């Protein structure tokens, strides 16, 4: 297996239960077990977890934010340093987003051509387009490349949703052709397209048909987790995911809380990313099977139990709630490091329980058991 | 008081009980409460406690090791950086030793002139003598200067003890004259002489007479804590301290354990220094009123009590034995920092209880109470 050839991108489904699937994506830099959670990476420095720590939590792939990497230190500099894998100290697969969401979310010109913007960090002028985004993701050397699309706001008028979806599909074809124009990228990386259409079923169908006609290695459901509430996100997923090709991975970008993930897998999603484990860890919040906890709470000052008494992570094998409480209350960076490591490992253990329960044909029961306990909050 | 003149060196005894004294040494950089414990300083870097942390433990004065400072970064470099107070970030009094003990303890030439040695750190050649030692301590800018003497080994033949004591007294006069030759040093610093004579009463008397004839600001009892055992050290102190001038401070160099300190104050010692609080802290050992403890012991893994339940230090206000146990077992530098801070603060609280009990005329009872509990070890 270590001495055997590695494919560019091969998705295999090993077991199904309803709309949920479990399987593997094989790529040249490693195997991704699905459903998969991708932690959001940053530069390999003393301020973040070590890459070996992130791998030991169970992560098979991480996400890079193209927009931030463009602004500092820049894509040309990362390429000169050997690419994102060398820059981040991570030798397994990396998915990069297109950079387009943070352009809107965080602007000199805007048209069907693409966008121009100035950096808040130094005032430098930057440009993004389907062609430029794919080029930058090539310079970063990422393994999964996201097509460049146009985000529709929330809430969105049906006219604005139609306009952004249609532009996104023209940009999806441009993304496809730019990716295919570069032999080194097309033979070694994969390209995902992004379905849009807001909450409107007919627009989602139009979008799915357009992406399937272009053809991609995987398909993301875009335009969700932007403030719509879980009920609505689930309702959109109910009809949107069946529209995508069944035999390719389905990616829900930027989701999310543990119960978001469970419900999305019930609806056919294979891949997830979120900053939540890290943001929560830095803020003194831990995920547990009994719901999130705020470790600063007085009730934890003498609690000798680990953050979660069923969590297998390296933190919970050693550190008590009481001592992580002490570290966080003192502002010691070790406290935030430990809670971040635990939160990412908890997410990976959630994904593993999901994969195991699908394989054993008991995922619907797992999801019900999970919700009953997570929302009772007997922590 | 803040707007009033400061004397070069003024020792006042406020209260006595038997041979024990409590009082103050006023100097230009601050007041030293006696009996005093001097922590042993190092360079103000990320590897040591912050100077403000050392001050907050209660220390009024710290000790600098002239030998180590000569070898790295060198006395001329420290002077160029503004002196030891600027180098160490410590603006209160500093006592420096002469460098002579580490010459023996850690050698190109040796005679009545002085010594020449090579540095293990770089092979550089270095020279020490009464004149050179005082000159180097002037470059360091220390407030209390130790005369340069010759250490007698332990055990020592009565002939070797006589020979080293007599050479030390000739060197004490040379130290006196070198110190007095430098107006800037003589007007702003103080000079201590060192009694020698090993375990032999007549040699100790000869030494005391010689030092009193020369005249010093304070008098150290040298040649102890070099392997002789507490009973013997106490026996030597019994007759040696009364030989020194009563109205000047008495300094027992390199002592020691808490029970060494208590017994030495019972015998007339006013000043102490030891690396023990730091060495123990780095090795996971804490001093307590119930004797030392090894925090790595399994019995502490769930112990929510502080290192010492009567200690007022900043560490014991916040951190449990259980969490310091966790930090030390993990090799986190914070663990060693906390135990070092607690150990130095414990030493200062020992000195404060000694001072208060002398002032109240209950020091003999304090010493008996202290020993009964420290040696019972009901920790
Ligand atoms: Zn954990
Ligand atoms: Zn303490």
């Amino acid at each position: 297996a270590q001495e055997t050839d590695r494919p560019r991108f091969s998705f295999s489904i090993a077991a199904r239960e309803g709309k949920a699937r479990t399987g593997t994506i094989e790529m040249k830099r490693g195997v991704i077990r699905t459903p998969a959670f991708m932690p959001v990476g940053t530069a390999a420095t003393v301020k973040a977890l070590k890459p070996e720590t992130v791998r030991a939590t169970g992560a098979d792939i991480i996400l890079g934010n193209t927009y931030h990497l463009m602004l500092r230190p820049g894509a040309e500099r990362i390429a000169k340093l050997g690419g994102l894998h060398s820059f981040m100290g991570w030798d397994r697969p990396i998915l990069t987003d297109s950079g387009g969401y943070q352009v809107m979310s965080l602007l000199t010109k805007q048209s069907e051509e693409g966008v121009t913007f100035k950096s808040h960090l130094d005032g430098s002028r930057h440009m993004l387009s389907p062609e430029r985004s794919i080029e930058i993701q090539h310079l970063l050397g990422s393994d999964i490349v996201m097509a460049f699309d146009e985000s529709t706001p929330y809430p969105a008028t049906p006219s604005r949703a139609a306009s952004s979806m249609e532009r996104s599909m023209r940009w999806a074809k441009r993304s496809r052709d730019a990716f295919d124009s570069r032999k080194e990228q097309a033979e070694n990386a994969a390209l995902f397209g992004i379905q849009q259409g807001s909450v409107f079923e007919n627009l989602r169908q139009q979008s799915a048909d357009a992406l399937a006609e272009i053809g991609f290695d995987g398909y993301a459901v875009g335009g969700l987790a932007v403030g719509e509430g879980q009920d609505e996100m689930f309702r959109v997923l109910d009809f949107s995911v069946p529209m995508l090709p069944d035999d390719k991975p389905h990616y829900l970008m930027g989701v999310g809380k543990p119960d978001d993930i469970v419900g999305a897998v019930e609806r056919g999603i294979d891949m997830f990313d979120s900053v939540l484990p890290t943001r929560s860890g830095r803020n003194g919040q831990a995920f547990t099977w009994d719901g999130p906890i705020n470790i600063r709470n007085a009730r934890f000052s003498e609690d000798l139990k680990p953050l979660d008494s069923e969590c297998h992570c390296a933190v919970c094998q050693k550190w008590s709630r009481a001592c992580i409480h002490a570290l966080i209350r003192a502002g010691e960076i070790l406290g935030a490091m430990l809670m971040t490591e635990h939160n990412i490992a908890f997410y990976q253990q959630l994904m593993q329980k999901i994969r195991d329960s699908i394989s054993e044909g008991r995922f619907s029961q797992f999801a019900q058991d999970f919700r009953a306990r997570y929302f009772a909050r007997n922590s």
Side-chain angles (χ1 to χ4, degrees), chain A residues 8 21 31 123 145 175 190:
Chain A
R8 176 189 68 85
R21 311 99 70 79
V31 177
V145 175
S175 299

Side-chain angles (χ1 to χ4, degrees), chain A residues 311 313 316 342:
Chain A
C311 178
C313 86
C316 292
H342 157 81

Side-chain angles (χ1 to χ4, degrees), chain A residues 16 40 57 83 88 92 95 108 142 146 176 250 290 327 340:
Chain A
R16 299 175 190 254
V40 177
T57 74
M88 291 180 154
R92 279 179 180 275
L95 179 148
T108 290
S142 55
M146 297 305 300
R176 177 82 261 178
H250 307 152
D290 299 292
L327 289 163
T340 296

Side-chain angles (χ1 to χ4, degrees), chain A residues 182 185-204:
Chain A
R182 215 172 267 101
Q185 193 176 32
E187 289 175 354
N188 295 293
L191 182 71
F192 282 28
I194 302 168
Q195 182 203 47
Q196 296 285 352
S198 181
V199 301
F200 307 95
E201 196 171 351
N202 63 313
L203 301 185
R204 290 279 177 182

Side-chain angles (χ1 to χ4, degrees), chain A residues 64-79 81-86:
Chain A
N65 286 131
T66 294
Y67 172 85
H68 298 305
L69 297 161
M70 285 168 62
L71 296 186
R72 180 154 61 199
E76 294 74 14
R77 180 60 182 167
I78 287 169
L81 295 171
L84 206 47
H85 298 83
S86 170

